[PDB]
């Protein structure tokens, strides 16, 4: 594929920095032709043959390709793609209403009806992707952005696909990526991956939505990963004293070591806790 | 343990930024009491209970503890430790002569006698650590700094211990850390770890010193890790056409999937290729 070999500065005005990914730098920008505001994602390119400062070209295309197919209200849109020697610049949809992580702390804990209002939107977005055999692999509060934060039940779009793959496979797909807190045991153990890893993440997100705490985080990175592979977590009455058995079951049907016994996305939408 | 709960700015002047680690920010600084120049490493602290922006407190102490014991000419020294709400600030020795990665590209390839001049110093530093049962876990050209770059056979000190552990164990130690290119298969497969992982890294460094290329890097992260677990590499005549069998053997006795059959640090110093 080929992106626009042009100066992004010619068509978009840069300013206010937003996210700060590993090799990704996000900046709030302004389209000159219309005045519309967009979000520009700078992806540094893997330099001279053998290096690690930057993302590989082949890995950048993968992300673009996925954003191209993608088309769903609860999911980000890619408008333009630029490129130069050093960086590829994805012009993306701007979601100004802040991350879900930010939103949580200020409420600190949601009611089950509120929690399911957020969850339904995720499950819709994740359902759409899984239909097209796309695994996000990085579902977490930081990649769940609200359109408007100051409305009663805020509406969300999913962001960041630098790690998403198409599981278009009678193949084998393994590797280690994502944030330790949210990764499924197969990623931790370096075992075959599928769409099932995202269902583990949602289980973790849901735990965080209800309790506020992360089910698997420990005092060290080592320990966080031990807990995940072991599946060492419990519904600590502290938070789950007044949580329904259905809500518990939903989470308990998603945090299952064996990816096959783990719930799928269509089963999650048919659950009594989520279903109307 | 307890660090200096004081403003680092009161005792050291900041300026020129050097490295840019994940949660670590390195800055070149100047001691006020003497005028001596030091390197200040800012470590962001893991914030409200459940988070990932920053290193855990327990993980920061571990690094400090290791730098405290540490005492060897080819190894960095920790002078002071400060702390505030957000960051812990390690005042470290300043190594101005740039990274080994930087040095390589401008040469771009070393002679075996030169290569062993660098290697001996590493093996000495790594030997000292392994004696005290300390595994660096992050041996790579970016963590190997030269004192003076413009001298014939430059002298090096090892840096960055945010990932180093003491393998003081009738215990189990597993987790995933380091740069994909240099990590040993047991880290990739999430299997028990020991001092042996560092011997894999040196094998990789040595390959890079002689050839310039990284033995296991592929076009994607997935592929890089496949090659490591598989141990898929060959002495490509392109680079190794004129490389000695001893140099080959040394590398070949270090890139062994099974950590036990892999060479130990004392065996590496007794090798004909390294030994006087």
The CATH number of the domain where A67 resides is what? 3.30.200.20
Closest CA to A104 of B260, B71, B171, B49: B49
- Apex CA A190: angle with CA B234 and CA B185, to 5°? 35
Is A210 in a helix, a strand, or coil? helix
Task: Among A48, A59, A225, select the one facing B175 at the smallest CB separation.
Answer: A225
Closest CA to B55 of B9, B21, B103: B21
Residues of A in contact with B219 (CB under 8 A): 56, 58
Locate A239 and state its tokens.
């938070």
Locate A237 and state its tokens.
């009455």
Is the same domain home to B114 and B212? yes
DSSP-derived letter for residue B145 is: E
CB B1 within 8 A of CB B64: yes
Closest CA to B26 of B101, B100, B85, B76: B76
DSSP-derived letter for residue A263 is: P
CB count in 10 Å sphere of residue B218:
18
How buried is residue B247: exposed, middle or buried, by Cβ count under 10 Å (0-12/13-18/19+)? buried
In total, chain A counts a number of residues equal to 276
Domain final residue, candidates A72, A97, A122: A97
Chain B residue with minimum CA distance to A48 = B105
Domain final residue, candidates A97, A122, A138: A97
Q: Which of B52, B163, B191, B217 to mutate to test the interface with A (most CBs of A within 10 A)?
A: B52
DSSP-derived letter for residue A142 is: G
For every residue of A215-238, DSSP letters joined together read TT--SSHHHHHHHHHHT-----HH
Is the same domain home to A175 and A256? yes
Closest CA to B213 of B229, B198, B224, B222: B224
Is the same domain home to B127 and B77? no
Is B136 in a helix, a strand, or coil? coil
Locate A6 and state its tokens.
């042009």
Q: Within its chain, how far is the Cα of B22 from the centroid? A: 15
Test B176 with A189 for CB contact under 8 angstroms. no
CB A207 within 8 A of CB A115: no
DSSP-derived letter for residue A190 is: T
Test A220 with B49 for CB contact under 8 angstroms. no
Method of structure determination: X-ray
| Resolution, Å (one decimal) | 3.1
Chain B residue with minimum CA distance to A165 = B222
Closest CA to B143 of B78, B202, B99: B99
Whole-angstrom distance, CA of residue A270 vs CA of residue A1: 39
Inter-helix orientation angle B112-131/B196-211, to 10°? 170
Residues of B in contact with A190 (CB under 8 A): 188-190, 225, 229
Domain final residue, candidates B97, B125, B159: B97
Is B171 in a helix, a strand, or coil? coil
B264 close contact with A: CB closer than 8 A? no
Q: Which of A183, A220, A223 to mutate to test the interface with B (most CBs of B within 10 A)?
A: A220
Is the same domain home to A67 and A134? no
Test B214 with A50 for CB contact under 8 angstroms. yes
User: 3-state SS of B49-93?
Assistant: CCCCCCECHHHHHHHHHHHHHCCCCCECCEEEEEECCCEEEEEEC
For every residue of B177-231, DSSP letters joined together read -S-TTT--HHHHTT----THHHHHHHHHHHHHHHHSS-TT--SSHHHHHHHHHHT
Instruction: List, in sequence order, every beta strand (DSSP E) within chain A.
Output: 12-20, 24-31, 37-44, 78-83, 87-92, 134-135, 144-146, 156-158, 165-166
Q: Which helix (H) or strand (E) holds A208?
A: helix A196-211
Whole-angstrom distance, CA of residue A244 vs CA of residue A251: 11
Closest CA to B203 of B106, B149, B134, B271: B271
What is the rounded (10 degree) CA torsion for B159, B161, B162, B165? 160
What is the rounded (10 degree) CA torsion for A25, A30, A36, A41? -10
How many domains does chain A contain in total? 2
Task: Please name the residue that has the structure tokens 């599981």.
Answer: A167
Chain A residue with minimum CA distance to B185 = A190
CB B126 within 8 A of CB B85: no
Provide the b/e sequence for B141-162 (b: ≥16 CB within 10 Å).
bbbbbbeeeeeeebebbbbbbb
Inter-helix orientation angle B245-252/B196-211, to 10°? 150
Closest CA to A177 of A136, A126, A217, A231: A136
Domain extent for A273: 98-276
CB count in 10 Å sphere of residue A10:
9
CB count in 10 Å sphere of residue A107:
10
Q: Confirm whether residue B76 is marked as ligand binding.
A: no
Is the same domain home to B124 and B231? yes
Is the same domain home to A148 and A276? yes
Is the same domain home to A52 and A180? no
Give first-to-last CA distance, chain A, whole Å: 43
Whole-angstrom distance, CA of residue B196 vs CA of residue B205: 15
List residues bridging with A25 in a β-sheet: A20, A42
Contacts of residue B109, defined as CB under 8 A and 6 or more positions apart, other chains included, come to: B210, B211, B212, B239
CB A146 within 8 A of CB A103: yes
Q: Within its chain, how far is the Cα of B81 from the centroid? A: 21
């Amino acid at each position: 594929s080929t992106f626009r070999q042009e100066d992004v500065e010619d068509h978009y005005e840069m300013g206010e920095e937003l996210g700060s990914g590993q090799f990704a730098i996000v900046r709030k920008c302004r389209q000159k032709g219309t005045g519309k505001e967009y979000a520009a994602k700078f992806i540094k390119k893997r330099r001279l043959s053998s290096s690690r400062r930057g993302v590989s070209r082949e890995e950048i295309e993968r992300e673009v390709n996925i954003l191209r197919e993608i088309r769903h209200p609860n999911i980000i849109t890619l408008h333009d793609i630029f490129e130069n020697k050093t960086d590829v610049v994805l012009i993306l949809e701007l979601v100004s209403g802040g991350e879900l992580f930010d939103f949580l702390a200020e409420k600190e804990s949601l009611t089950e009806d509120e929690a399911t209002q957020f969850l339904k939107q995720i499950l819709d977005g994740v359902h759409y992707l899984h239909s097209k055999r796309i695994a996000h692999f990085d579902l977490k509060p930081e990649n769940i952005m609200l359109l408007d934060k100051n409305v009663p039940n805020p509406r969300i779009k999913l962001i960041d696909f630098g790690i998403a793959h198409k599981i278009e496979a009678g193949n084998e797909f393994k590797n280690i990526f994502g944030t330790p807190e949210f990764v499924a045991p197969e990623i931790v153990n370096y075992e075959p991956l599928g769409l099932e890893a995202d269902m583990w993440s949602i289980g973790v997100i849901t735990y965080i939505l209800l309790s506020g705490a992360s089910p698997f985080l420990g005092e060290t990175k080592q320990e966080t990963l031990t807990n995940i592979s072991a599946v060492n977590y419990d519904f600590d009455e502290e938070y789950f004293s007044n949580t329904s058995e259905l809500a518990k079951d939903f989470i308990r049907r998603l945090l299952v070591k064996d990816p096959k016994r783990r719930m799928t996305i269509a089963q999650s939408l048919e659950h009594s806790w989520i279903k109307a």
